[PDB]
Amino acid sequence: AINVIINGINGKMGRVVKENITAQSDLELVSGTGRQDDLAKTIQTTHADVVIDFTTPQSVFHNAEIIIQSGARPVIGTTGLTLEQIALLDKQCRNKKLGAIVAPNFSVGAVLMMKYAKEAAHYFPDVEIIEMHHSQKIDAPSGTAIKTAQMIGEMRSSRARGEIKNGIPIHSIRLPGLFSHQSVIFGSNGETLTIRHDGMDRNCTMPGIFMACRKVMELDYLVYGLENLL
Ligand SMILES: NC(=O)c1ccc[n+]([C@@H]2O[C@H](COP(=O)([O-])OP(=O)(O)OC[C@H]3O[C@@H](n4cnc5c(N)ncnc54)[C@H](OP(=O)(O)O)[C@@H]3O)[C@@H](O)[C@H]2O)c1
Ligand SMILES: O=C(O)c1ccccn1
Ligand SMILES: O=C(O)c1ccccn1
């Protein structure tokens, strides 16, 4: 029985986590907190074991510190942490023998897509990325596409033609009706191999989130990246 707080309970992601957690029998939602709630107080009142954070880049680091300093384990999906902040959080976690998970992408499908794309790039040097999002996704290319290109470029090194990121063209489609999609297309003599993730809605992150809630109990340090729980 894991006592969970959802921080950011009123946000788009916090609302979806609230809906889905009820069906997780080994987890109990003991509170949902928002901007003007006292997070440390709630952790103490509820004896929280885990705090899921889907808040804002301006608050995420201080939220993480409050969660650890209060004795609970952060499972952080919020974007915004710097390298130096993650390294400091890790030392704080290990000092207290408390676990933490920071995942820039909580979709298992997206993280496996990136894993297999990086592997395949050892065999197929020619590759492009197509990513497609609803129009509310303002940034292009997407952070996931940029990270994918970074991973592929690392493996290799070891105007219609898109935006090159670490050597890899990325094409960004923005259309109503889509949610979050990416296809990595490798080409060779006579064939292609495509690794394609289709995120239909925000439930796409829930198996990754709930997995983190469970694994963070068995950890005494910080894990960065959902792929390191797999
Ligand atoms: N890691 C992943 O797979 C992934 C997936 C989706 C989203 N995200 C990231 O997670 C974050 C949340 O995204 P979203 O779409 O849910 O955003 P959102 O709809 O804007 O929700 C953010 C929520 O956090 C609340 N909040 C703001 N400051 C807070 C604070 N100091 N303490 C507690 N709550 C606070 C807001 O409250 P108010 O309503 O009062 O403003 C709002 O309810 C973003 O950084 C987003 O990029 C990550
Ligand atoms: O692993 C990362 O750093 C990452 C993953 C997906 C999106 C942005 N960043
Ligand atoms: O709001 C988004 O853009 C989103 C949310 C969850 C998963 C992928 N993308």
Swiss-Prot record:
Give the superkingdom in one word. Bacteria
Q: Name one GO biological process term.
A: lysine biosynthetic process via diaminopimelate
Question: Localized where?
Answer: Cytoplasm
Q: Record's InterPro entries?
A: DapB_C, DapB_N, DapB_N_CS, DHDPR_bac, NAD(P)-bd_dom_sf
What pathway or pathways are given for this protein in its record?
Amino-acid biosynthesis; L-lysine biosynthesis via DAP pathway; (S)-tetrahydrodipicolinate from L-aspartate: step 4/4
What does the record give as EC number?
1.17.1.8
- What are the cysteine partners in each disulfide bond? none
Q: Where is the active site?
A: 133 (proton donor/acceptor), 137 (proton donor)
Q: Name one GO molecular function term.
A: oxidoreductase activity, acting on CH or CH2 groups, NAD or NADP as acceptor
So what does this thing catalyse?
A: (S)-2,3,4,5-tetrahydrodipicolinate + NAD(+) + H2O = (2S,4S)-4-hydroxy-2,3,4,5-tetrahydrodipicolinate + NADH + H(+); (S)-2,3,4,5-tetrahydrodipicolinate + NADP(+) + H2O = (2S,4S)-4-hydroxy-2,3,4,5-tetrahydrodipicolinate + NADPH + H(+)
The record's section on Pfam families has:
DapB_C, DapB_N
Q: Name the PANTHER family for this protein.
A: 4-HYDROXY-TETRAHYDRODIPICOLINATE REDUCTASE 1, CHLOROPLASTIC-RELATED, DIHYDRODIPICOLINATE REDUCTASE
The protein's matches in HAMAP family, at most eight in alphabetical order, are given as: DapB
Q: Which NCBIfam families match?
A: dapB
Job of this protein = Catalyzes the conversion of 4-hydroxy-tetrahydrodipicolinate (HTPA) to tetrahydrodipicolinate.
Q: What is this protein called?
A: 4-hydroxy-tetrahydrodipicolinate reductase
